[PDB]
Design a protein around this ligand. Structure first.
Ligand SMILES: *[C@@H]1O[C@H](CO[C@@H]2O[C@@H](C)[C@@H](O)[C@@H](O)[C@@H]2O)[C@@H](O[C@@H]2O[C@H](CO)[C@@H](O)[C@H](O)[C@H]2NC(C)=O)[C@H](O)[C@H]1NC(C)=O
Ligand SMILES: *[C@@H]1O[C@H](CO[C@@H]2O[C@@H](C)[C@@H](O)[C@@H](O)[C@@H]2O)[C@@H](O[C@@H]2O[C@H](CO)[C@@H](O)[C@H](O)[C@H]2NC(C)=O)[C@H](O)[C@H]1NC(C)=O
Ligand SMILES: *[C@@H]1O[C@H](CO[C@H]2O[C@@H](C)[C@@H](O)[C@@H](O)[C@@H]2O)[C@@H](O[C@@H]2O[C@H](CO)[C@@H](O)[C@H](O)[C@H]2NC(C)=O)[C@H](O)[C@H]1NC(C)=O
Ligand SMILES: *[C@@H]1O[C@H](CO[C@H]2O[C@@H](C)[C@@H](O)[C@@H](O)[C@@H]2O)[C@@H](O[C@@H]2O[C@H](CO)[C@@H](O)[C@H](O)[C@H]2NC(C)=O)[C@H](O)[C@H]1NC(C)=O
Ligand SMILES: *[C@@H]1O[C@H](CO[C@H]2O[C@@H](C)[C@@H](O)[C@@H](O)[C@@H]2O)[C@@H](O[C@@H]2O[C@H](CO)[C@@H](O)[C@H](O)[C@H]2NC(C)=O)[C@H](O)[C@H]1NC(C)=O
Ligand SMILES: *[C@@H]1O[C@H](CO[C@H]2O[C@@H](C)[C@@H](O)[C@@H](O)[C@@H]2O)[C@@H](O[C@@H]2O[C@H](CO)[C@@H](O)[C@H](O)[C@H]2NC(C)=O)[C@H](O)[C@H]1NC(C)=O
Ligand code: NAG
Ligand code: NAG
Ligand code: NAG
Ligand code: NAG
Ligand code: NAG
Ligand code: NAG
Ligand code: BR
Ligand code: BR
Ligand code: CA
Ligand code: CL
Ligand code: CL
Ligand code: CL
Ligand code: CL
Ligand code: CL
Ligand code: CL
Ligand code: CL
Ligand code: CL
Ligand code: CL
Ligand code: CL
Ligand code: NA
Ligand code: NA
Ligand code: NA
Ligand code: NA
Lengths: 527, 176, 352
C-alpha cells in the first residue's frame, strides 16, 4: 500500500509490473481548481487542500476538444483521440516512479501536441512506465486546456487573457517543484519534453521568465514556437474571439460581457463553433494558440529568440524524415491513405492552394518553382513527394533548424537529430514514409516490450534513444557511452552537425535541407 | 575466410570473424553473406585506398575521395552483389550518355555529372561540377576525412568512411 | 572530520583523500558520489581507480552472490528481507568462510563483494558518470608502480614462486592466462597472448615470466589509472601522474618481482625518514621528496618540490600525456606511458 504525502494532502498510487520489476504510478493527481463557471477562460487557480486519501489509480478526464472523425475505426488516426471522458474538469497530472523508490531521480515532464486544440496525457504512446523502469527517471505528464477554452484571448483582461493552457502547463511544473521530492525526485533536475504543439510549448517555456526556475533542460520533438502555425498574432486573436462571439450569439460592446456570455454557453456550443472562426482552415490550422499576452510572453517571440532573451541551458531538437505526409490526407486533392497517391502537376498546384490559403499567386508559384525542379526523370511520384516536402519543410523542419541555430548562437550546447525510421507496425501506407508523430513511441520505449510485435532492430533503436534522452536529462549530453555508438556532436552554427536515428547506419551529417530552408527562412516570409 | 586468407593463422581468421560478425542484430539471414563481401572489399580495396589517400595528402597536395554507390539498372549480376567492383567504369566513360542504350534518365544525369567532374579534374585539378547547383566536392584532409557520395538520389558530403573497419585492417591486421 | 577536526587544529576546508589499490578506487568513487562532494578538497589515487576491472560489482553479479551466500549458509528464502534476518543470526566466522565460494572461480584479483550501483552512494554506472563529466571538479594526483602485476603471480599462476626465479614456458604462460582470465573465450586469451608475446627477441628466458606480470599489471592497474586520469582531466582540472620505479632495498620478496604493487606506500608515509631503520640514504632522500610533493599537493594542489632544484612535475593533459618518474637515480619527464599496451586493454579488450 503506497501513499505519498503532498503539500495538498495524501495521494494513493498503484503498482505496475514492467519487465520483471515494478513501477509505481499515480495517475490523475489534481493540480489546479477545476476551471469551471466563473473560472472558465481564466488562469488556473491554486488547489484548496484535502484531508483524506486521493485515489490516483486511473487516468483522469481529458480536456474538452473536437475529435478527428476523418478515419473512423482506423488505428492510424484513432490512436491520437482522447481515451478518457472529456470534461472541463481536466486539470490533472500523472507521475511514474521507479521501484524501489529513487533517492533523487531526474524528472522528465511530457507536454503533448495536438495543434493546441486537441491531445491528452493518457494516450498509450505517452505511457511513462518504460522510462521509469529502464532508466530510473521519474516521468510526469499533465493535461492542459486546449482550443478556445485554453487560448481564447482579449489581451490584458484577466477574464480571458490568453495563454491559459500554457499557464496550466506552468502550474503543473510548479506542482513538480513543490512536490516531487516527496516522490523521490530531484526538483533541480527537470527536463521538459514534448512533440509538435508540445515542443512549441517547451520552446515558449524557454522564453517565459515565469518558467525559468521550474526546469533545467529541454527536448523539442518536431516543433518550435517559430513554426508558422505556433503563435496567433494579436490581430488574428481579436478577429477570432469576436467571430466566436458572433457565432454563439454573444456579440456585445463591453468586452468583459462577451466573456460572461461565453461562460454560459456550454462546452459543446463553444467547440462546434471554433472551426469556423477562420474563414479557411488548413490541416495545420491552430485557431486558438499562444499569443503575446504581456504575461507569459512579454514580446513577439521571434524578437526574444533573435536577441538572446531566453533561459540559457542545453537543448535537444529534432525532426522526422517525412513530417509533411500525414497532413496530405486531410484535404489535399488526389491523396488517400488507401492508394499510392500519385498526383499530377495540377493536383500539386491545387494542393498548394489547400495549404497556403492566401498566399498570393506569386507566393504559390515560387514554392512551385523551388520544389518542382526535377532531377529528373520523370518519376511519377515526383509531385506526391514534393508536396509532402513542401508541407514538412515549411511547418516543421526549417523552423526547428532555425530555432536550433538561433538558440545555439548564444553559447549553449544544442544537439539536433533527424529521425528516419519507419515503424514496422505503421498502419498508414508506405508512401507516407517516416511520419510526423511516429518517433514518440520509440522515445517512450514501447518497442522495449517484446510481447508487442516490433522487430529486434527496433528494440535496439528504442533502447538506444531512451538511453540518449535519459542521459540528456540527467547530464545534458545525449550520448550512448557503453555500446560503441556514434558520438552525438553538438550543433554549432558554422558546421551544423546533426545525427541520424535509424536501425541501419547511424550517421553524422551536416546542414540538413540547406537549399530548402534558405527558401522558407529567407525568401518566404516577405511574400 | 579460409578461401580468401589461405595462410593466415587460425587466430588471424578468428579476429576477422570477431571484427565483422558482431551483429546489430537480428538475426538477419543475410548477415554473413553481407559480412564476407565487406571483409573482402574492405581488406582488398577500400581501406588501402583510404590509407593511400590519407598518406598522400599529408604531404601537402589536394586530394579528393568518392564513394560510388549506384547500381547500374542494367547490371547482369544479381541484386545481392550490390554496387559491384568495376561497375563505375561505364559511368566514367559516359556510356549512359548514349540514349539508344537502355540506361535510365537518372543514370544519364549521373554519368553526365561524373564525366564533367573527371574532365574538370584533368584540365584544372578540381573535380567540381560548377554549372548545375551541384554539391561542392571538398578536399580530403587527414583530420576531417571528407568524401563525396556518387548516386542518382542525394549526393552527399560524408566523413571518415569505414572508420571502425579500416582501423582493424590498417593497424591490427598487418601484424598477424 | 568536517565536524571535529577544527577542535584538533585542522582545516576542514583543506582535506585530501589518499588511498591505495581498493582504497584508491574508493577515493575515485568519492569523486563520483554527490554525498561526498562537500567532505573533501582534493584526491590522490595510488595504484587504483574505480574503472579497474576488479573495482565494481555489477548488479547481476551482486545478486548472484548474495543468493549464493544465502544458499551456503542455509539461508535461502523467498522474502528478501528474510534472507537478511537469517544472515544476521549467522556469526561472523560462518559468513567469512563462505564468501570465497560465492563465485565459481576466483582469481588473485577477485573482489567478491565490492561497490555496486546502489542508487544512493552511486546513482548510475560509474563509467557513464566519468565519461560525461559528472564528478567533483578539483585536482587529482594519480600513479602506479613499475611492476604492479608480479605480486599476484605467486598466488596461483603455474611455475611461479617467491623462492626461485620463476622462469616459465609458453605453456605455463598460457595456463597462467587461464588462471587470470577464467571465462574469457579462447579468442580473448589468444589475443592477449598475441599482444604480449611478440618478442624483441632473443630468446630471453625471462620473456614469458615478464610478460604475464605485465599482462596482469597493465590490465588491472596501469591502463585503468591512465584512462581515469585522462577522462578526468578532459573536464578541465589539473591532474598529475607518476610512475613509481624504485624497489625498496629491504623488499622481502625476490628480485624478479621488481617494483611491486603496494611498495610505494612506505615511501609516501615516510618510513625511510627513520634512520634507525636500515633503508639507504638515497631512499631517505626519495621519501623526503615524495612526502614534500604529497604535502604540497594537499595544501596547494601542486605536487612540486620547490626548494632543492628538483624536476618540475608537469600537469597531465590528454594530448601530451606527460608523467613523472619517481626513482633514486634520475627523475624524468616522460610521455604516454604504456601507449601500445593500453590501446589493447582500453579499446580492444572490453568487446571480448
Ligand atoms: C476576420 O473575420 C471576418 C468575419 O468572418 C466571417 O464571419 C465569421 C463569424 C465566420 O463564420 C467566418 O467563416 C466568416 O468568414 C472575415 O470576413 C469575411 O472574409 C471572407 C473571406 O475573405 C469573406 O468572403 C466574407 O464575406 C467576410 N465576412 C464578413 C462578415 O466580413 C475576415 O476575412 C477575417 N480576417 C482574416 C482572415 O484576416
Ligand atoms: C551464479 O551462481 C551459480 C551457482 O553457483 C554454484 O553454487 C554456489 C552456491 C557456489 O558454491 C558456487 O561455487 C557454485 O558454482 C553458478 O552456477 C554454477 O556454475 C558452475 C560453473 O559454470 C557450474 O559448473 C555449476 O554446475 C553451477 N551450479 C548451479 C547450482 O547452477 C553460476 O555460474 C553463477 N554465475 C556467474 C559466474 O555468472
Ligand atoms: C539532489 O541533487 C541536487 C542537485 O543535483 C543537480 O545539480 C543541478 C545543478 C543539476 O545539474 C541536476 O541535473 C543535478 O542532478 C542537490 O542539490 C544540493 O543540495 C541542496 C538542496 O537544495 C543545496 O543546498 C546544495 O547547494 C545543492 N548542490 C548543488 C550542486 O546544487 C540535492 O540535495 C539532492 N537531494 C537529495 C540527495 O536528497
Ligand atoms: C486514390 O484515391 C483518391 C482519394 O479519394 C478516393 O478514395 C479512394 C480509395 C476511392 O475509393 C474513391 O472513391 C475516393 O473518392 C482518388 O482521388 C479521387 O479521384 C477521383 C477519380 O474518380 C475523383 O473523382 C475525386 O475527385 C478524387 N476525390 C477526392 C475526394 O480527392 C485518387 O484518384 C486515387 N489515386 C490513385 C488510385 O492513384
Ligand atoms: C583556515 O583556512 C580556511 C580556508 O583555507 C583554504 O581555502 C580553501 C578554499 C582551500 O583552498 C584550502 O586548501 C585552503 O587552505 C579559512 O576559511 C575562511 O574563513 C571562514 C571559515 O569558514 C570563511 O567564512 C571564509 O570565507 C574563508 N575564506 C576562504 C578563502 O575560504 C578558515 O577561517 C581558516 N581557519 C582558521 C585560521 O582558524
Ligand atoms: C620454482 O618453484 C615452483 C613452485 O612450486 C614449488 O616451490 C619450490 C620452491 C619447490 O620447493 C617445489 O617443491 C614447490 O612445488 C616450481 O613449480 C612446480 O614445478 C614442479 C616441478 O617438479 C611441478 O611438479 C609443480 O607442478 C610446480 N608446482 C606448483 C605448485 O606450481 C618451479 O618448477 C620452480 N622453478 C624454477 C626452479 O625455475
Ligand atoms: C480508493 O480505493 C481504495 C482501495 O482500492 C478504497 O479502499 C478507498 O475507499 C477508495 N476511496 C474512494 C473511492 O474514495
Ligand atoms: C464593463 O462592464 C462591467 C459590468 O459587469 C464592469 O465591471 C466594467 O467596469 C465595465 N467597463 C466599461 C468600460 O464599460
Ligand atoms: C548495450 O548492450 C548490452 C549488451 O552488451 C545490453 O544488455 C544493453 O541493453 C545495451 N544498452 C544500451 C543503452 O543500448
Ligand atoms: C547541366 O544542365 C543543363 C540544363 O540546364 C544540361 O544541358 C547539361 O548537360 C548539364 N551539364 C552537366 C555538366 O551536368
Ligand atoms: C516480507 O516480510 C517482512 C516480514 O518481516 C515484511 O516486513 C515485508 O513487508 C514482507 N514483504 C513481502 C512483499 O513479502
Ligand atoms: C632539501 O635539502 C636540504 C639541504 O639543503 C635538506 O635539509 C631538506 O630536507 C631537503 N628538503 C626536501 C623537501 O627535500
Ligand atoms: Br503579435
Ligand atoms: Br551495473
Ligand atoms: Ca585463436
Ligand atoms: Cl531525405
Ligand atoms: Cl503551369
Ligand atoms: Cl523557417
Ligand atoms: Cl531561394
Ligand atoms: Cl589498409
Ligand atoms: Cl581493432
Ligand atoms: Cl618499464
Ligand atoms: Cl601454441
Ligand atoms: Cl583500461
Ligand atoms: Cl590492438
Ligand atoms: Na503588435
Ligand atoms: Na491532424
Ligand atoms: Na543495469
Ligand atoms: Na593479495
Amino acid at each position: 500500500d503506497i501513499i505519498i504525502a503532498t503539500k495538498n494532502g495524501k495521494v494513493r498510487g498503484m503498482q505496475l509490473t514492467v519487465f520483471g520489476g515494478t513501477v509505481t504510478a499515480f495517475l490523475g493527481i489534481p493540480y489546479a481548481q477545476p476551471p469551471l463557471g466563473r473560472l472558465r477562460f481564466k488562469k488556473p487557480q491554486s488547489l484548496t487542500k484535502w484531508s483524506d486519501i486521493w485515489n490516483a489509480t486511473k487516468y483522469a478526464n481529458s480536456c474538452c476538444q473536437n475529435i478527428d472523425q476523418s478515419f473512423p475505426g482506423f488505428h492510424g488516426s484513432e490512436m491520437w483521440n482522447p481515451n478518457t471522458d472529456l470534461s472541463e474538469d481536466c486539470l490533472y497530472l500523472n507521475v511514474w516512479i521507479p521501484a524501489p523508490k529513487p533517492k533523487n531521480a531526474t524528472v522528465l515532464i511530457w507536454i503533448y501536441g495536438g495543434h493546441f486544440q486537441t491531445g491528452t496525457s493518457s494516450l498509450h504512446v505517452y505511457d511513462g512506465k518504460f522510462l521509469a523502469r529502464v532508466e530510473r527517471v521519474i516521468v510526469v505528464s499533465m493535461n492542459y486546456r486546449v482550443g478556445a477554452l485554453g487560448f481564447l484571448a482579449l489581451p490584458g483582461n484577466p477574464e480571458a487573457p490568453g495563454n491559459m493552457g500554457l499557464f496550466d502547463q506552468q502550474l503543473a511544473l510548479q506542482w513538480v517543484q513543490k512536490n516531487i521530492a516527496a516522490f523521490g525526485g530531484n526538483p533541480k533536475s527537470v527536463t521538459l519534453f514534448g512533440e509538435s504543439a508540445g515542443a512549441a510549448s517547451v520552446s515558449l517555456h524557454l522564453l517565459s521568465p515565469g518558467s525559468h526556475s521550474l526546469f533545467t533542460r529541454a527536448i523539442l520533438q518536431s516543433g518550435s514556437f517559430n513554426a508558422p502555425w505556433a503563435v496567433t498574432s494579436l490581430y488574428e486573436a481579436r478577429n477570432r474571439t469576436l467571430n466566436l462571439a458572433k457565432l454563439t450569439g454573444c456579440s456585445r460592446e463591453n468586452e468583459t460581457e462577451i466573456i460572461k456570455c461565453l461562460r454560459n454557453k456550454d462546452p459543446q456550443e463553444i467547440l462546434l463553433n471554433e472551426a469556423f472562426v477562420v474563414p479557411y482552415g488548413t490541416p495545420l490550422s491552430v485557431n486558438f494558440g499562444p499569443t503575446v499576452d504581456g504575461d507569459f510572453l512579454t514580446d513577439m517571440p521571434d524578437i526574444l529568440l533573435e536577441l538572446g532573451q531566453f533561459k540559457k541551458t542545453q537543448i535537444l531538437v529534432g525532426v522526422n524524415k517525412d513530417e509533411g505526409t500525414a497532413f496530405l490526407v486531410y484535404g489535399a486533392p488526389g491523396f488517400s491513405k488507401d492508394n499510392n497517391s500519385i498526383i499530377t502537376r495540377k493536383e500539386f498546384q491545387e494542393g498548394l492552394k489547400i495549404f497556403f490559403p492566401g498566399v498570393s499567386e506569386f507566393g504559390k508559384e515560387s514554392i512551385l518553382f523551388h520544389y518542382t525542379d526535377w532531377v529528373d526523370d520523370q518519376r511519377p511520384e515526383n509531385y506526391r513527394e514534393a508536396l509532402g516536402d513542401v508541407v514538412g519543410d515549411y511547418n516543421f523542419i526549417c523552423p526547428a533548424l532555425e530555432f536550433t541555430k538561433k538558440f545555439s548562437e548564444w553559447g549553449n550546447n544544442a544537439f539536433f537529430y533527424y529521425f528516419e525510421h519507419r515503424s514496422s507496425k505503421l498502419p498508414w501506407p508506405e508512401w507516407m514514409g517516416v511520419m510526423h508523430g511516429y518517433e514518440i513511441e520509440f522515445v517512450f520505449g514501447l518497442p522495449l516490450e517484446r510481447r508487442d510485435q516490433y522487430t529486434k532492430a527496433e528494440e535496439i533503436l528504442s533502447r538506444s534513444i531512451v538511453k540518449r534522452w535519459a542521459n540528456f536529462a540527467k547530464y545534458g549530453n545525449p550520448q550512448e557511452t557503453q555500446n560503441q555508438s556514434t558520438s552525438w556532436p553538438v550543433f554549432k552554427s558554422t558546421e551544423q552537425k546533426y545525427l541520424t536515428l535509424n536501425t541501419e547506419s547511424t550517421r553524422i551529417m551536416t546542414k540538413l535541407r540547406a537549399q530548402q530552408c534558405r527558401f522558407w527562412t529567407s525568401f518566404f516570409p516577405k511574400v
